Design a protein around this ligand. Structure first.
Ligand SMILES: [Ca+2]
Ligand SMILES: [Ca+2]
Ligand SMILES: [Ca+2]
Ligand SMILES: [Ca+2]
Ligand SMILES: [Ca+2]
Ligand SMILES: [Ca+2]
Lengths: 192, 209
């Protein structure tokens, strides 16, 4: 019995048929007779294996049950994008000497997403800079690496006398840029 | 055994799905191959199969809105060209991912209602759309809401919207053109039945004599 993929948060309705087993039929393991109990069941005469409730991947990502030659049953729970990204802090801070060459790493911001970042992009965060103030000696003096969140400086006019500090409104966007966006602030200090 | 494959996967690719296996187990060496829309006809090359190991392969990420389902055929053929069994009905089901934000059909909606109607009465209906699946997942299911009301007169919270259908209603006596001829409600449609992504429009309700 090849593993069974079941998207979390399904509509159904329930109870809901998964795969028929090919002589009375009964199923066992963590999910059926062991806790969490009664999540999966089986029509004893027809053998249709059943799901009784919508699943929550974050709670339980898979199951290993047994049909009754003991048939192995693997239930893999595929992800849905039911968690929004959140920066770990409201304000991030970092600094550089004014003489740093373009490319210099200022800081690394981070946003968390409880969804799956292995097989899907639902937990994959895309970073971007919303805006910069002040815009002196010009705008877009900093980049943020899309996946690492490393803020770098790419300008050459860093002058503490003129501008001792830059505030960056930054963004974190799940589904690797296509999904929900959250916002935080990164304050760059030009060191004396 | 239909294979459920979420669209928009990270892979990497190619990516194993299931291992095919014939009836002639010990007897002879067997070559596997697949045919159909998705394999050797348009769109070609999307799925493959490892000739000897029989592993069924996905070569690129899928898009349910492009193609929701594949119906392929797997073929067991000995090194001598001979076959013993019918083709294998391989059914790939592309499960939906929430890759479409809800969109209101209009940015401003326009309704009217008589100043002296029973509270509960329908005023108008708004509608946002979502191209994701609404049958097997909530990804395409929109949940409506009223963010805010202006003016607050006679009082606040005079209307309500239906979560499913988007039918706006009056839930108050004391509508009077004389006092308040028109209201402006900020409305929102949010997919995943309220848990996903939100979009915003405005419903402008006129009061009638
Ligand atoms: Ca969940
Ligand atoms: Ca997410
Ligand atoms: Ca999830
Ligand atoms: Ca798609
Ligand atoms: Ca959607
Ligand atoms: Ca979709």
């Amino acid at each position: 019995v090849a593993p069974i993929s079941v998207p979390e948060n399904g509509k159904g309705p329930f109870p809901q048929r998964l795969n028929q087993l090919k002589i009375f039929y009964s199923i066992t393991g963590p999910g059926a007779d062991s806790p969490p109990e009664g999540v999966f069941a089986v029509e004893k005469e027809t053998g249709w294996l059943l799901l009784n409730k919508p699943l929550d991947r974050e709670e339980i990502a898979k199951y290993e049950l047994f049909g009754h030659d003991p048939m192995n049953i693997s239930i893999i729970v595929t992800d849905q994008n039911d968690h929004k990204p959140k920066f770990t802090q409201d304000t991030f801070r970092g600094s550089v000497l004014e003489g740093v060459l373009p490319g210099t790493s200022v800081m690394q911001v981070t946003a968390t997403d409880e969804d799956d970042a292995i097989y899907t992009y639902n937990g994959v965060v895309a970073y971007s800079i919303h805006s910069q103030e002040p815009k002196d000696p010009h705008d877009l003096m900093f980049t943020i690496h899309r996946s690492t969140g490393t803020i770098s400086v790419i300008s050459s006019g860093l002058d503490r006398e003129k501008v001792p500090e830059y505030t960056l409104t930054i963004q974190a966007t799940d589904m690797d840029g296509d999904g929900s966006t959250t916002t935080a602030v990164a304050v760059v200090e030009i060191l004396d």
